[PDB]
Symmetry: D2
Subunit: 237 residues, 4 copies
């Protein structure tokens, strides 16, 4: 729904809406046109790991991807997230395919968020961690094509019985409870997220990618957000 901060792992270069001429990681602030990007040395058929950080004192949103016994790529962006996001949010995972496709499979997801004030008597803390997923994950809001398979992996996008990915799917999984990330008299807010993903593709140059995103609590797949908009934005402004 209308408000969106996101870390995007973007397999398919969509040049005319600002994407660099290669797979990339980027930080998206209220738009699909990453405020910052870094080359993403994608490795199809391998398990990748994403770490994401933010601290409201530092005011830096950071992300890393690496694969097992391989190099890593990092992207950063200076952003005060309380001038962007509501004080209460939902956190989620998003993925799409277009004409070109890919599995957008998630193996694990963890998230930690803290909110501190003056008195230690005034604060909150939230943590969740999933290694594989229930067949009816009742603490997840599954949106669009998102489903958990017979292996207990979370499939954000359509995959056939065969084990093979479909074109034109959107999926999203959001954690059930809203997260309190700012408040009038907050001194420090911070969050950390990790996920692991498996992207497989027959295709030359797969599509479209995965995000971790933070949104207003009532968020939903906006109509017309398929493909290159990754399930997040209604247009490409």
């Amino acid at each position: 729904a209308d408000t969106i901060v996101a870390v995007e792992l973007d397999s398919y270069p969509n040049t005319d809406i600002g994407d660099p001429n290669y797979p990339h990681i980027g930080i998206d602030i209220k738009s699909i046109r990453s405020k910052s990007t870094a080359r993403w040395n994608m490795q199809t058929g391998k398990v990748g790991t994403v770490h994401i950080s933010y601290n409201s004192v530092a005011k830096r949103l950071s992300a890393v991807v690496s694969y097992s016994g391989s190099s890593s790529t990092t992207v950063s962006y200076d952003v005060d997230l309380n001038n962007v996001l509501p004080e209460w949010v939902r956190v989620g995972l998003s993925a799409t395919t277009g004409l070109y496709k890919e599995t957008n499979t998630i193996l694990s997801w963890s998230f930690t968020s803290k909110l501190k004030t003056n008195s230690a008597a005034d604060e909150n803390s939230l943590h969740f961690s999933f290694h594989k997923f229930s067949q009816n994950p009742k603490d997840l809001i599954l949106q669009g094509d998102a489903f958990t398979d017979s292996d207990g992996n979370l499939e954000l996008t359509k995959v056939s019985s065969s084990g093979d990915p479909q074109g034109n799917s959107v999926g999203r999984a959001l954690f059930y409870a809203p997260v309190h990330i700012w408040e009038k008299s907050a001194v420090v807010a911070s969050f950390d997220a990790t996920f692991t993903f498996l992207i497989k593709s027959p295709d030359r140059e797969p599509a479209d990618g995965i995000t971790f995103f933070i949104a207003n609590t009532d968020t939903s797949i906006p109509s017309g957000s398929g493909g290159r908009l990754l399930g997040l934005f209604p247009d490409a402004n």
Copy 2:
């Protein structure tokens, strides 16, 4: 009906023969008649602390109550909770007032749950927002101007509950160990010294709600006294 597992602090008269003659802390499995209780030296106008824990290998559910510079009271019950509770639950607090001037104010509440074969949950609150969007408030429950969670009305016979918003995955076939731990602090404010009062941390089915009839000594948790 709801499926209930509770740890309660109870200053009501329990006029049933089995049960005790003083304020007590007790462990409730599916019924208001505590499977196990212990003395509770209930101190009005002082902040109290409850720690509860369970481990599915140890199959021992236990709880402690203390006040600062005070001594504590503990209760345990050997129980296997994966044969009592559904796989997915919601956790919460509840309170009820008698016919006294008294508050049930929650200053803090934390919870951790672990499910190993694969699943972890943790929340922690010190005071509460005016709009606690991650709490499901039931009955007379509201967060006050001070950021304190008032489970009951600030005369008596109020019932109020507060659930954490996400369901908790506490068991599964593939499970080797499930554990949980919870802490809360509370303040009963009252001009009386031994008012009739009840306050609980509880676990239940995810679609749980207040049963009509459940006031006073059924703690907002149960319809019968069975």
Copy 3:
């Protein structure tokens, strides 16, 4: 050193000192003669996982072992650990081999301990987590034959360059910092531990096992504690 609580994973049945007639898990309280045991369905050449719990309110020391896609075994014992242990301890892992042998290899180790009183303003908390190990693990006290190998696995007992285990080794690894587990006005103390282990053996019936143990801070391999005494006790009382 003199005071020892331990969860033992006992591969070799030593009948005449109380061992049951099979591999077992046991809780050892100040003696090698387990206060409680359960049949341990050992699976050589597989990664096993031990979880250990205690809570001073419940007064129950618990442990579980399982392997990957296999059944699990559990043992329990009602013990108030503050009548047994000092208020400050070191936590550790031990292993031995005798004439019969085995690798006693540790892949990960985590430990959490909490101590609460009246006021939340009076408490302590400690947590460590190792997945694989530095070649010079500076936060471990390595005792006897304990070493971290070229794979970053912790080998509590002697293994040849070949990859093959030697007989008559003792090893122990203790975490550097002492742990505060009780105090005059404690309301609740609790700890949790997890480790993963690989036991390989040519032998028919390997020896001798691995423990997780809690001891006085100045603990050390007592002389004459080899073999069946698992690196912990100086005799078999």
Copy 4:
């Protein structure tokens, strides 16, 4: 020499031209001359809170100071700490007094460190034991009858430090992300309003000790003012 990374609270006059004219919070990289500082509204006899964090992807080290019902001051410095600090370190607190009647009492201290490719450490103390065996106390540092950690003497020119006992693994070749976070609360008690005082959280080589000459404004951390 020792290798020092510190966050400091400083009320000494700093008479060197570059440096500031009021009590300040600052980030020290290997020298007493803070790579980055900010105003510190230093409230004597009120409990203060410091939060510090770092992430090796963000390469931004930052800190906040606040008092209850008060507003806060923050400081950041872009730095890569795997080029400044050894791989293994010891973390600690330090304080120094001037020529004033003032305490440097630590009420609480927590620390978390993560090293990912594989390594986690966390400790948390609210008050301290009479015999804090997991702390290495240096110089005038002792735990008092109230369980509070006094870094300096209860006249001035005391220096005192307290290290956490285990070494911390903060970097390695194979490392993808290293992060840490620390919090402490403190109380400077003094009959004066703006006494000359210094209090730090710091990271150093594991064999670190108090350098001679390091009194007052060198915070117990550095031998020179270079």
